[model samples]
Target: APRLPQCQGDDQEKCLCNKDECPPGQCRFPRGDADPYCE
Candidate 1:
């Protein structure tokens, strides 16, 4: 998944975003799946 700057957190260990945090028009999981992409 492509990490976004806004996704970072205070705890470096947990400073990451989950699949659900992906942009509304983007997909973050199941890499090759394109169903989540917007037309």
Candidate 2:
């Protein structure tokens, strides 16, 4: 899976595990609890 610094997650496998997950390029993981939503 393609990983990015911004797409960092406790369990990245379930989060932004691939580049496709971030279509716009930016990927974000929840600080407390959230989805790797694009920015």
Best-performing candidate as measured by lDDT: 2
User: How do the residues 1-39 of candidate 1 rate in per-residue lDDT, one tens digit apiece?
Assistant: 555443332322211234333434333233564432211
Candidate 2 segments whose C-alpha is farther than 4 A from its true place: 1-20, 23-25
Whole-model lDDT values for every prediction: 0.34, 0.46
Tell me the tens digit of each residue's lDDT in model 2 across 1-39. Answer: 555343454433433523435543345556666545656
Using all chains and alpha carbons, the TM-scores for the candidates as numbered come to 0.17, 0.30
Which pairs clash in the backbone of model 2?
A: none
lDDT of 2: 0.46
At residue 30, what lDDT does model 1 achieve? 35
Error of 1 at 39 (Å): 14
Point to the candidate with the largest TM-score: 2
Error of 1 at 33 (Å): 10
